[PDB]
Amino acid sequence: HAAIASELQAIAPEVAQSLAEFFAVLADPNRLRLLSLLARSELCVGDLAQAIGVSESAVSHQLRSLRNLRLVSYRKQGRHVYYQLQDHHIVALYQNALDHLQEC
Amino acid sequence: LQAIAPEVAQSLAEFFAVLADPNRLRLLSLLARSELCVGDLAQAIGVSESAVSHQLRSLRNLRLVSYRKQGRHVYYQLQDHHIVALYQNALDHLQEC
Ligand SMILES: [Zn+2]
Numbered sequence: 001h002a003a004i005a006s007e008l009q010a011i012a013p014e015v016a017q018s019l020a021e022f023f024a025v026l027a028d029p030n031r032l033r034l035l036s037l038l039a040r041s042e043l044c045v046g047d048l049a050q051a052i053g054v055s056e057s058a059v060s061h062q063l064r065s066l067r068n069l070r071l072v073s074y075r076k077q078g079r080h081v082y083y084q085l086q087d088h089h090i091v092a093l094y095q096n097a098l099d100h101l102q103e104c
Numbered sequence: 105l106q107a108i109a110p111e112v113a114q115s116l117a118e119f120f121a122v123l124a125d126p127n128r129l130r131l132l133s134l135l136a137r138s139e140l141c142v143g144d145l146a147q148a149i150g151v152s153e154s155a156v157s158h159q160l161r162s163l164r165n166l167r168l169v170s171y172r173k174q175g176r177h178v179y180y181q182l183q184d185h186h187i188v189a190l191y192q193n194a195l196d197h198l199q200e201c
Pocket of ligand 1: 087088089090196197198200201
């Protein structure tokens with residue numbers, strides 16, 4: 001019987017359901033490759049396409065759902081559109097997940 | 105630059121896939137605040153000790169949780185601090201969005 005076992009309670013089923021869906025969104029090798037690039041630098045669709053070795057149309061399409069899913073965001077500067085990870089939570093959960101499997 | 109190797113991306117994808125389980129997340133949400141014995145978790149979750157023990161076996165094999173011996177009790181805890189951090193960050197991100 002842990003010291004504070006009586007003081008704890010699990011996350012609500014609705015919250016756990018929403019969190020599970022979030023992780024389901026990340027269980028995609030293609031999405032993770034794109035996020036691995038944005039974790040190190042903000043990049044334009046042109047740079048991402050060259051790195052992953054796919055067309056700009058393909059990256060642009062994948063980035064759309066990523067944007068809708070609130071995993072990435074973008075900023076416009078002059079004639080360029082730079083994509084970035086949504087927030088620091090995204091890079092942290094990404095880096096921690098990777099470090100975890102590296103540490104096993 | 106270069107993206108992560110394809111097998112690394114695949115392993116990471118499978119890792120997030122195992123986390124896409126509401127029941128596992130409820131268990132992890134408890135361990136995120138304290139290591140706990142099977143009895144404490146079973147009562148918190150409202151399920152039998154046998155059930156939680158079974159759920160924990162899977163989590164152990166998946167390297168999400170570990171256990172240790174402290175006196176006359178076995179306590180389960182999250183495998184490492186990375187699990188702690190990714191859980192909290194994912195949760196906070198969802199709470200603000
Ligand atoms: Zn966030």
